[PDB]
Each structure stands twice: as C-alpha cells, then as structure tokens.
Amino acid sequence: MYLGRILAVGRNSNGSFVAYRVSSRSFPNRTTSIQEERVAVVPVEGHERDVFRNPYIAYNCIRIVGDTAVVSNGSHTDTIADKVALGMNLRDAIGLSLLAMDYEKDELNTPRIAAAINGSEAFIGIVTADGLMVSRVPEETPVYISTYEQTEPAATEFKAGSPEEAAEFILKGGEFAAFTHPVTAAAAFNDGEGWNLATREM
Amino acid sequence: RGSHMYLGRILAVGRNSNGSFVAYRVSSRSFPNRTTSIQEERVAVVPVEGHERDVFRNPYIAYNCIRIVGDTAVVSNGSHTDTIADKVALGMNLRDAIGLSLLAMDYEKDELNTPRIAAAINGSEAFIGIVTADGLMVSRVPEETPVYISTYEQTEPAATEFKAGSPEEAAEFILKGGEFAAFTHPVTAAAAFNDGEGWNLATREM
Amino acid sequence: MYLGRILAVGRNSNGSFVAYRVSSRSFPNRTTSIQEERVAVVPVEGHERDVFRNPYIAYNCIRIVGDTAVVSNGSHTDTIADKVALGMNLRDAIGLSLLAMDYEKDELNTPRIAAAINGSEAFIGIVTADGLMVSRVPEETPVYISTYEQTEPAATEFKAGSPEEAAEFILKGGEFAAFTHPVTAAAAFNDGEGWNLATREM
Amino acid sequence: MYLGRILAVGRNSNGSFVAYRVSSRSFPNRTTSIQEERVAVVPVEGHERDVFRNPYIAYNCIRIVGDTAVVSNGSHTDTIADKVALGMNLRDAIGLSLLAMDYEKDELNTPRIAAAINGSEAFIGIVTADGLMVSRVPEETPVYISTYEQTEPAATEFKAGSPEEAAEFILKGGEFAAFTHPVTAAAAFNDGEGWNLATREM
Ligand SMILES: O=c1[nH]cnc2c1ncn2[C@@H]1O[C@H](COP(=O)(O)O)[C@@H](O)[C@H]1O
Ligand SMILES: O=c1[nH]cnc2c1ncn2[C@@H]1O[C@H](COP(=O)(O)O)[C@@H](O)[C@H]1O
Ligand SMILES: O=c1[nH]cnc2c1ncn2[C@@H]1O[C@H](COP(=O)(O)O)[C@@H](O)[C@H]1O
Ligand SMILES: O=c1[nH]cnc2c1ncn2[C@@H]1O[C@H](COP(=O)(O)O)[C@@H](O)[C@H]1O
Prior knowledge:
Four copies of one chain form a homotetramer.
Chain A: E1 6-12, E2 15-23, E3 30-35, E4 38-43, E5 59-65, E6 68-72, H1 76-85, H2 90-101, E7 112-117, E8 122-128, E9 131-136, E10 143-146, E11 154-155, H3 163-172, E12 182-190, E13 195-201
Bound molecules: inosinic acid (4 copies).
The site of one inosinic acid has 17 residues of chain A, from loops.
PDB class: hydrolase
Keywords: alpha-beta-beta-alpha NTN hydrolase fold, hydrolase
Assembly: tetrameric
C-alpha cells in the first residue's frame, strides 16, 4: 500500500506526460513549487531546516529541456536533464546518471527512479541495491514505478488532458487512490503545443 | 515465442550444492564453424582450423567468453568479458563493472541489434546483465537459484536447476542438458566451476 | 587572484591530507560543519533559505570512507565517496562521478573539482565546459586546484601536521594568502592513526 | 623519437580533418583499408593470424558518422562513433568510451587515444595507467597526440587540402618526419562538401 515516491510516464489520446507524487511518512511537510521549466519538491514554510536533516527530501522532480520532459525522485532529475540538453539519447542519459548516483544511502537503501519522454520515445529507470534497469516505455501504454513495493514498471490507464488533471490523477485517481500517505503531486503535459506544468495538493 | 527455440548465445551463472559456476554456450546459424579454447585464466571462442578469416567478416564471432580474475569468474558473449574482468581486477564491484561496460559498449551493430549479455560471480555475490536496443539491465542473481539468459528470445534472466559438480559437467549441461537440450543450433560450450578450492575451466563439443 | 573554491591533497612528512576552502563573492554567508565522517558547507544562521536560491552552495565538501578521504566543491563528494565505499578504485570513482554530473549550470559554467586519497595513492580531477581530467597526484608533492583560474593541478609546499593546521594553511597560509574572498575552510588529516577533521574561519 | 600510434585533428584554411598513423616495432606487417565510412588497420596478406597473437593490432582507426569524423588507435573508434550516431555529444562519447575501455593490458599499459570532430567542435582524449583526459581542441590550431612520449595534446601546423595530403603529412611530413618506425597512415578530410577518406603507405 505504501509505495513512497511515484512517477508515471507515457502517452494517451490527449497527449504525452510525466507525473510525480510524493508519498511520505517521516517528511510529510513538503509541497511542490513551479519555477522556470521545472517543478521542485520543497519544505513548506516553517520547515526549511529539514533539508539539513535529510539530503534527499528537496530536489527538482520535473525538468523540461526543449521537447523533452524529465521526472525523478531526486537531484538526478537535473543530472539527466542536463545530459539531454547537451546531447545524449534518453536511455543513456538515464542509465549513466543512475549508474553514477546509485541508490540513496538512507535506512532503506531507497532507490532512485526516473523517466524521460520526448516527441518520439520514452524511457523509465530505477537503480536499487540489487541492480540497475532502464527500459523503453511501451508505446501502447503509460507506466508508473515507485521507490517502494512497485520497484518495476507497471501498466496504468492514465487518463488526463492537462498537467492539472495528470497531477490530480497520480495523487488521488484510479489505482493511485489506494497508495497511502499522499502529500503533494506535480505533472508536465504536452498536447502537441509544448510542455505545461501543474501541481496538486491533498 | 514458443515456435522460436533458437536462443543464440547463452550464459548461466549461480551456485548449487556442489559449488559456484558460470557456463557459456555458442548456438549459431551463420557462424557454426567455431570452437572454444582454454588459455591462462580464460576461455576463448575462436574459428576452427580453416576458418580463421571469418573474424575479418564479422567482428562479433571471436572473443573471450570466460575470464577468471582472482576469486571472480566473468562470462559474456563478447569482448566485454575483458572490459568487465579488467575493471573487477582494478577494483570495481560486480554490478558497476557490468553496468559500466554494457552501457559503454552497447548492443552489437549487426542485422539483429544483437544484445551483449554478461554475468560475474565471486565468493559472496553474483550479477547478471544485458543491454539491448530497448534498454539496459543489471541485476543481482538470486542466492536461491542459478539463472540463465540469452541474446535471442530469453533476453531476461530465467531460473534454472543447473546440476553440475565440475566445469566439465557444467559445460555439458548448458550444451545438451536439461531445458537447454531444446535450444537449437548448439555449436560449442565452456564453463568455470569453483567447488571451494579455486576456479577450474572446461569446454565441451557436440 | 580570485580562485573561487579550492582544494588541496597530498602527503608531507607529517602525514596525508585533503584541504578545502570556500572563497566566495556572491555567497559569503556560509560556514563549515563537522558531522559523522564528513564536513559540510552550509549557510550561517539566518541565511538557510539561500540553498533554495542556488543549488550549488550547500554540500558535503569532505567525506571519510574507511581509509579514504574524499574532497570536492559539490554534492559529487558523496557520489564519489559512495562508489569508493562500494568498491571502486579512486581514478574511476572520480572519473565516473565527474563525467556524469558535469560542470555546474550557472552563469560561469563553474567546474566541479575533486580529489581522493588513501594509504597508497591519490587522484585529483576536474570537469569543465572544455573537458574532463583525472590524474594521479604526484607522490613527491601535494597539489591544489580551484574552480576559477587555477583549473589545473599545481604543486604546493603544504605544511601541516594536523587537520587544524591544514585548514588554516589553505585559508590564510603560504601562497593561499594571495587568493581573495576567503570565507571558510576545512581539512582531513591522517598521521597514520586515522582520519581527523577540522574547520577554520577567518 | 618513437611515438607509437599517432592521431591529429583540427581545421586549417582548407577544411577540417582527422589523421592517423601507425608506427610499430613488433607489428610492422600491417596496412590500412578503406571500407564504407571507415578505415581499418589490418594485417597485410600472409599475416592474418597476427590478430590472434595480439588483440590490439587490428581495428577501425577512422569512422565517419554523418557530419562527424572519429579517429582512434583501437576498437574504441566504434564505441565512440556508435554513441555519436545514437546521440551523444563528442566530449561524453569519448569520455565514456575511454573510461570504460581503459588503457590496453599489454607490456606497456599502452594508452587508448581518440578524437572526434564535427562542423562546430572537436575533442581529443587519452586514458593511461595514470589518468583520463578529454579536452576541447583549440579552434585556432590542429593538435596531435600519441600512445608513447607525446601522451598530451600538442599543437601542429598541419597543412593539407585533401585526405591524401593529410595522410601523407602525418606519415612523412613536417615534424612527423622525425617520429620513427612509420608503417601506414590514413585520414578523413572535409572541405565543406562531406568527409572523404584516403590512406598512404611508405
Ligand atoms: O521525496 C523523496 N525522494 C527521495 N527519497 C526520499 C524522499 N522523501 C523521503 N526520502 C527518503 O526515504 C526515507 C523514507 O521516507 P518516508 O518513507 O517518507 O518515511 C527517508 O529517510 C529519506 O531518506
Ligand atoms: O558468438 C557470438 N557472439 C556475439 N554475437 C554473435 C556471435 N555469433 C554471431 N553473432 C552476431 O549475431 C548475428 C547472428 O548470428 P547467428 O545467429 O549465428 O546467425 C551475426 O551477424 C553476428 O553479428
Ligand atoms: O561552494 C560552492 N561550490 C560550487 N559552486 C559554487 C559555490 N559557491 C558558489 N558557487 C557557484 O559559483 C557562482 C559564483 O559564485 P561566486 O564566485 O562566489 O560569486 C554561483 O552563482 C554558484 O552557482
Ligand atoms: O595499432 C595499435 N594500436 C594499439 N596498440 C597497439 C597497436 N600496435 C601495437 N599495439 C600495442 O603496443 C605494444 C607495443 O607495440 P610496438 O611499440 O609497435 O612494439 C603491443 O604489444 C600492443 O599491445
């Protein structure tokens, strides 16, 4: 039931997207913030100092580089987006970044997850204490992955026609309604005219 | 799927009640004139006498398929066997050695985008990996069971009750034993086995 | 004369060490903090929010993993230290981490610098918009490198017999006295009985 | 005076190029062969079996991928070219390939050298038992590097207006005339209308 941090990526009849949701037990005092071409997970007012207690709770969860949208549960969002910006195919950008940064060094060896999608293809990846996996996202269906339990891509009928709807869906919609401890969500959606961002709170 | 019993190159890795091992088998349709050769701490896949020039026709048919570096055994379907073994020798955990090598070398640029597969195992752990046109995967080998993977069809680790108590038996098994008997076009096989007193090598022919 | 962030690594008659110094014009309100097996560069009281303005000003500058000391001007200190901890020679740990993380995406394409040293060898590295370099530290002499100007290893007669002295030296000693805008420094020293840490302020 | 394998890269008033020269003491029975978009170093008739004695003597020394020319002293020519073809900037393609493949495991720890150049930029690299280096080629001057002695980029007034002239020059021209044991050379030249290849023998 508790999947921790979750991300979804893919395309539906309305367009392409990436969605992100923070689920948390020990660090629930966080929200999402939209800035230029990116969405950051940051502490809510009055909890700024939490970033000094744990180095894995504040980071950009979404980055937009040209026609590409990158989503992840950590600072590797920037590592991956930067490589894409400097010229590197999606598979290698995710693969190299995850191989180098590796799983998080906390009490649970929390995995680093990520995905990236452009106009022609998409990839999803994860690195844990047991391995590294980067795979092409099925053209026929959107998928999601999480840091706990669902540490493997899983198909999902992700319905959404805007970033607002995408963020809401991963937060409280469909099968995601059953995953516990929701805190905040964000998403990027491209209906063909460019990437738009949005966030949703409980 | 089912009607496609040709798996191409196959490797197996794991431990059983007799010890730890890596096994390799060459299955081939277009390059069946090859054999395995044992050299110092390694086993190479090479053309049989009279076909030496094939290496100049295709750069992926001759290579070391097994390398032993200290307590570690490395197995793969290409020259990345050396890339990985070298990193292990210079100090690099198994997962990263395989991951970095496969990420860099990538799938083979032939008519089928033939994947590069590999595995490595030491006294405490083992990892298996593959890189294809659709991705990269390196995973810890289950302590409870040996696994195998191939370049075609079985491009994902699969459990196997690998019975063997020596490198000779391991090579024979992946060549004609158990479920491997059903995989077509066998050519030659090799294996490394460690019963606790060190890695020993062997090859088997049809 | 402004070298930005500086690091030194090597051995002298007293032992082996790594030293780090923060020089800064736009973010001078920072100090160094010692925690378990590491030293972090963090904002001084009342400036915590600066970490949300620039993602490159707060990070562990020194990490100790067993017999190895790692020093760097960014979060790649952890990326490198983690690889060393999981088994990876110094050259590759630095090489892989810098190749993946790359130079910083600010107004100056600020390079990422790093060094690591154990009982038998040491390496130093840098990645800029013009390249990547990782090299063995000369056994005969300590060296230093910075993010601006001295973007290449340079020999230095680094005198010090403790982490306190090492931190002081890179802050105000020898040729470092001429490098401007000093803010805070830290160092790790091993006289043969283990790595000890220290920080020094102006 | 013996530099082993040598490569040059850069641009002059006539165009851009990469040049390669095999110098050898123990394996002089080799020549260069032009194939589709590539030049291979192979044994001369009657010495085919040498490839089974040493794994580092036969390989593609030049690969052309679209607007990019790649040159190297080993099979990493393909590793690098393939990454460029699949989308990867020149610096990272060379950096990743050299980091992974490393120096050659022979009696001399022979380095792996490489360079790549397209319409807007060029990079040169080397990996030895002492390190890894990938750097931007100066826009103002061509440079060369070798496996022995000149294991660092060096400026060269490389005169040539065609691949034939480029191959000849690195083989017997200018300062290269002084480097001993020449065997065979090859080059790729782009005067603006595409990459053309050529080889030259003593
Ligand atoms: O948003 C996040 N991304 C990545 N790791 C996180 C995040 N939030 C928490 N963690 C890590 O996961 C552990 C578990 O957090 P929890 O499951 O929410 O209680 C923490 O101690 C952190 O180290
Ligand atoms: O032993 C091998 N290892 C890796 N690739 C191979 C090997 N043998 C053949 N190949 C590649 O796989 C393609 C198919 O070989 P085949 O399946 O035997 O017909 C060839 O064109 C080669 O590029
Ligand atoms: O300690 C540091 N490590 C890495 N980058 C830094 C650090 N301090 C500042 N920077 C970056 O360098 C730029 C210039 O900083 P300044 O030279 O101190 O004014 C900043 O805008 C940051 O992006
Ligand atoms: O063309 C080449 N590229 C890379 N290494 C080579 C080449 N030729 C020879 N070598 C390596 O360099 C060593 C010395 O070659 P030599 O200097 O020509 O005698 C050999 O044993 C090989 O391992």
